[PDB]
Amino acid sequence: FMVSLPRMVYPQPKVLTPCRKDVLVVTPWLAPIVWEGTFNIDILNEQFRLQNTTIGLTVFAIKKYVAFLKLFLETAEKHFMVGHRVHYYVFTDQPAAVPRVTLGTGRQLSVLEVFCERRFLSEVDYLVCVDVDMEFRDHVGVEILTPLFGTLHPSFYGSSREAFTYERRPQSQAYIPKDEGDFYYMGAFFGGSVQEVQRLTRACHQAMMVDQANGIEAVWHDESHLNKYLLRHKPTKVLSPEYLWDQQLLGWPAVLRKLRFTAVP
Ligand SMILES: OC[C@H]1O[C@@H](O[C@H]2[C@H](O)[C@@H](O)[C@@H](O)O[C@@H]2CO)[C@H](O)[C@@H](O)[C@H]1O
Ligand SMILES: [Cl-]
Ligand SMILES: [Hg+2]
Ligand SMILES: [Hg+2]
Ligand SMILES: [Hg+2]
Numbered sequence: 001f002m003v004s005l006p007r008m009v010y011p012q013p014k015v016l017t018p019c020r021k022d023v024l025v026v027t028p029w030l031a032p033i034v035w036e037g038t039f040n041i042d043i044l045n046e047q048f049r050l051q052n053t054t055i056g057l058t059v060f061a062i063k064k065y066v067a068f069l070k071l072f073l074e075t076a077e078k079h080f081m082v083g084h085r086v087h088y089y090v091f092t093d094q095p096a097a098v099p100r101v102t103l104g105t106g107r108q109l110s111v112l113e114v115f116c117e118r119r120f121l122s123e124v125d126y127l128v129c130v131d132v133d134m135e136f137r138d139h140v141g142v143e144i145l146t147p148l149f150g151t152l153h154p155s156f157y158g159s160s161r162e163a164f165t166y167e168r169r170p171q172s173q174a175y176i177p178k179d180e181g182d183f184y185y186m187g188a189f190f191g192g193s194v195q196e197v198q199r200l201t202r203a204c205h206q207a208m209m210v211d212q213a214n215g216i217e218a219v220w221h222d223e224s225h226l227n228k229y230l231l232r233h234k235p236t237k238v239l240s241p242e243y244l245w246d247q248q249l250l251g252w253p254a255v256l257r258k259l260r261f262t263a264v265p
């Protein structure tokens with residue numbers, strides 16, 4: 001049951017005026033591709049707040065990677081789902097090394113040493129899975145929430161499918177031939193409902209175990225399998241490279257109005 005939105009004043013959408021004329025904003029299976037300018041964050045914030053949405057953000061910080069936690073968490077506090085309920089899950093081998101970061105109200109952090117994944121189902125509505133050696137530089141909000149989403153890898157968004165670095169050996173479960181494929185998604189940023197995210201990770205785990213039993217390891221490991229999964233189970237939203245960038249390596253192209261989540265130099 002979705003409650004009614006309140007009266008809101010905002011620019012009327014124009015039917016005969018395309019959103020963005022420089023990029024594809026919807027996939028062939030009718031999934032929005034999220035770019036700046038395609039969404040009114042005020043309307044979306046209302047919709048999700050009225051649902052008392054809770055977002056779980058998971059990160060794995062092992063060994064030297066624990067050093068990236070402070071900047072990651074501090075910037076997430078400034079740009080990630082601000083205004084909504086957020087639960088951070090930090091999986092690490094050094095629980096005592098997790099920095100004490102000051103959190104805004106309605107936000108919490110759980111340190112799990114490497115639990116019952118069934119806990120996710122009762123604690124959050126959506127799960128966002130990212131790499132820790134990153135920092136938020138701009139808004140990353142509810143516009144990304146949907147049953148299942150993948151993010152366009154910043155190095156291949158303009159590449160043809162034959163150039164995608166998919167696993168090309170038919171002996172692997174992550175195999176994708178040259179005439180197949182929509183996009184090349186990066187394994188560093190994906191998510192969706194708890195149910196869909198667990199289905200994806202469960203599928204990846206089983207496929208990788210099958211490859212190991214067969215004596216093969218996909219070219220890009222988990223990412224190869226992520227791409228195979230998203231090819232056969234189309235994501236309900238696709239995030240543009242605005243959500244996963246590396247300015248040192250790729251600069252700042254005009255097509256990117258905002259650089260929201262970037263690699264740390
Ligand atoms: O091809 C998948 C891997 O891409 C790596 O990024 C590379 C990119 O592939 C290459 O074409 C060039 O742009 O340099 C990039 C940075 O080394 C990722 O680092 C790796 O995780 C895979 O996604
Ligand atoms: Cl992840
Ligand atoms: Hg628009
Ligand atoms: Hg369990
Ligand atoms: Hg996750």
Ligand SMILES: [Hg+2]
Pocket residue numbers: 201204205208222225
């Ligand atoms: Hg996996």
Ligand SMILES: [Hg+2]
Pocket residue numbers: 200201204205222223225226229
């Ligand atoms: Hg995966």
